[PDB]
Structure 1
Amino acid sequence: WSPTINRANVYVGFLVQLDLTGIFLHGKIPTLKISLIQIFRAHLWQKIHESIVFDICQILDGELDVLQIESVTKETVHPRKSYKMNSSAADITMESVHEWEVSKPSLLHETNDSFKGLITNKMWFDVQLRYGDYDSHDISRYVRAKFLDYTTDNVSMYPSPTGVMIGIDLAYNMYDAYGNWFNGLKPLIQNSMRTIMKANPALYVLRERIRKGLQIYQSSNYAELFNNDIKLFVDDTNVYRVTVHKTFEGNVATKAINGCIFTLNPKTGHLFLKIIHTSVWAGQKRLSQLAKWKTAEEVSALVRSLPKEEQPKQIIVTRKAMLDPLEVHMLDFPNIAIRPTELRLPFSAAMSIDKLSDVVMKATEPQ
């Protein structure tokens, strides 16, 4: 009952901002604070925000030339910017190739638009986290308010006057954005947001923590694999691969290489081999975790691609800790079960096969 117990419509609560988070407490409420801290342990809020920003950047990179984008600069903000609720700053500044004809300040879910109002060469994305609560749980409205406030007054450390304020209510899992848009951007943005909500690592972690706090919950079998029902072995061992080597000076250069996602149908022998490229791992951290997420995403994509007749029943996973992400990604497909296994299956030796290895080597993109 945190979102009623702590809430904005308080009589006299001295609104302290909780430590290293964006979670206002209207007065000292006892156990609540502790719980919040537990949830948002190890600078979780910041991680979430940064993660979101990173995702956005990635999305932008993916769709550069489609929306006429010169460069997508992630600004070097002050660490606490995630949890400075009073002020704000442009997280992802965005240079244009040609001159954008942006709309008036409007919401992310608006069917009717007009792209003949304002013009601009530069834009910005702001990601604003908030912990919701029963009174002000509406996210869209909040974001609008923020936009009205920040953009207008004196200077809100935005390089351009026009931009967008993405906002994710962490306590209600609602998201909405508001600001200025150019033709074809908005739907894409919406889609991206949806994707993030479905599966961002940080967000997932947060959710898990919340669940924990609440205490909420939802060899012999080898011959069963080869019945008439369709299945898919999925390996993630060779997704993030590295080669290490000393230079003449002495520096050990840990160079990431092109990896694979071995997805084998044991019935038909269809190896749906997604080749992960070295450009995915550029300027990243918490890398193994990221890789798992990527793998999950790929799997989801594959599933989507497959029609209802050709879709699997049991997606089998080789490793133990490839379950959760996959599950998260496969909430769209609840009919498809995700199966673990005691078998340390040898699909990590996909790179031992020659042709496959060669293919992996000779890839200049995600393929």
Structure 2
Amino acid sequence: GAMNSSNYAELFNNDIKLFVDDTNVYRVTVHKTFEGNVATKAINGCIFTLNPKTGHLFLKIIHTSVWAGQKRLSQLAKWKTAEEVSALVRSLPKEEQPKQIIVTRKAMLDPLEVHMLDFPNIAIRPTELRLPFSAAMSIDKLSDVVMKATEPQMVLFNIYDDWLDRISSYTAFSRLTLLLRALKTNEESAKMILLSDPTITIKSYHLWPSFTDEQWITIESQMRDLILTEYGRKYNV
């Protein structure tokens, strides 16, 4: 069944699993027409497919052309997501195929289950966790490759950079969710915290800056302060 606070350590065991977030697959800007009606213009999207143990991100770029002359796009987005995930699973060798896929949104369960009928041994699971994976398009390098794509494209990342050299998956995943949760609640403030010191850069082959263990503690603390402040504001408490 469902993934929660109670079965959290299961993410970091040795059964291959993937999170799938469909929240940036179908992206629109809403605008006024000359006649003063409202219309949407689709922009490039992405499927966020993450192995939480290894940090391997399968960023499948959804080019706006997939929507051309289709109806009910928010429904189609869930089925296109499931088609792309099924195809990634088929593309992987057997021993790299996941034993579980956890969808961040319950609406993905039937589309993925029907696309995965050929894989009855892969459990499709919802989560009660509120994961901030929607903020993935606040990571500059992930945003850059989505917006520049001229065709459908799969791009492979490690969202933990080289952190697993120094910390466990559990700690790496907590750092990732804290960074994303912060970027989601206040993007500008979050991004200011990450680049304030020009001496700490992002390696060409990384997503985040090259913080020492000490500088990560300071950053993690600044991100936690940002989240609680913004929270006091949201709710006047």
Give me the TM-score of the superposition, normalised by structure 2.
0.60
Does residue 262 in structure 1 map to residue 59 in structure 2?
no
What's the CA shift for 1:248? 6.2
What's the CA shift for 1:244? 1.5
In structure 2, the residue matched to 1:295 is 81
What's the CA shift for 1:247? 5.4
Retained in 2: the 8 A contact 1:319–1:344?
Answer: no
**Deviations along 1:306-334, whole A, 9 cap, x unmatched?**
11111111111100110011111111111
**Deviations along 1:152-201, whole A, 9 cap, x unmatched?**
xxxxxxxxxxxxxxxxxxxxxxxxxxxxxxxxxxxxxxxxxxxxxxxxxx
Secondary structure of the equivalent of 1:222? helix
In structure 1, the residue matched to 2:109 is 323
Q: 320, 326, 344: which one pairs with 2:130?
A: 344
| 1:260 counterpart letter in structure 2 | C
Does residue 312 in structure 1 map to residue 84 in structure 2?
no
**Deviations along 1:43-69, whole A, 9 cap, x unmatched?**
xxxxxxxxxxxxxxxxxxxxxxxxxxx
Report which of the two structures shows the higher radius of gyration computed on alpha carbons: 1
Matches within 5 A, 1:278-289: 278-289=64-75
Structure 1 unaligned residues grouped into runs of 5+: 1-218
RMSD (Å) for aligned C-alpha atoms = 1.3
What's the CA shift for 1:235? 0.4
Whole-angstrom CA distance in 1 between matches of 2:94 and 2:29: 40
Identity, % of aligned pairs? 100
More helix by share: 2
Q: 114, 136, 140: which one pairs with 1:354?
A: 140
Retained in 2: the 8 A contact 1:265–1:271?
Answer: yes
Secondary structure of the equivalent of 1:344? coil
Does residue 220 in structure 1 map to residue 220 in structure 2?
no
In structure 2, the residue matched to 1:250 is 36
In structure 2, the residue matched to 1:153 is none
Whole-angstrom CA distance in 2 between matches of 1:315 and 1:347: 15
Whole-angstrom CA distance in 1 between matches of 2:34 and 2:105: 38
What's the CA shift for 1:252? 3.1
**Deviations along 1:272-319, whole A, 9 cap, x unmatched?**
010001111112211211111000000000000111111111111100
Does residue 364 in structure 1 map to residue 150 in structure 2?
yes
Whole-angstrom CA distance in 1 between matches of 2:110 and 2:36: 40
| 2:94 counterpart letter in structure 1 | K
In structure 2, the residue matched to 1:236 is 22
In structure 2, the residue matched to 1:332 is 118
| 1:221 counterpart letter in structure 2 | N
Secondary structure of the equivalent of 1:245? strand
What's the CA shift for 1:251? 4.3
**Deviations along 1:217-241, whole A, 9 cap, x unmatched?**
xx11111111011110000011111
Whole-angstrom CA distance in 2 between matches of 1:222 and 1:228: 14
Whole-angstrom CA distance in 1 between matches of 2:34 and 2:75: 32
Whole-angstrom CA distance in 1 between matches of 2:121 and 2:93: 13
Secondary structure of the equivalent of 1:271? strand
Give me the TM-score of the superposition, normalised by structure 1.
0.39
**Deviations along 1:116-156, whole A, 9 cap, x unmatched?**
xxxxxxxxxxxxxxxxxxxxxxxxxxxxxxxxxxxxxxxxx
Structure 2 unaligned residues grouped into runs of 5+: 154-237
Secondary structure of the equivalent of 2:18? strand
Q: Which moved more, 1:238-247 or 1:344-353?
A: 238-247
What's the CA shift for 1:246? 3.0
Whole-angstrom CA distance in 2 between matches of 1:265 and 1:281: 28
Off by >2 Å, runs of 4+ in structure 1: 245-253
What's the CA shift for 1:249? 5.8
Secondary structure of the equivalent of 1:297? helix
Whole-angstrom CA distance in 2 between matches of 1:311 and 1:347: 22
Whole-angstrom CA distance in 2 between matches of 1:269 and 1:332: 26
| 1:321 counterpart letter in structure 2 | A
Count of aligned pairs: 149
Q: Which has the higher contact order (CA 8 A, sep 6+)?
A: 2
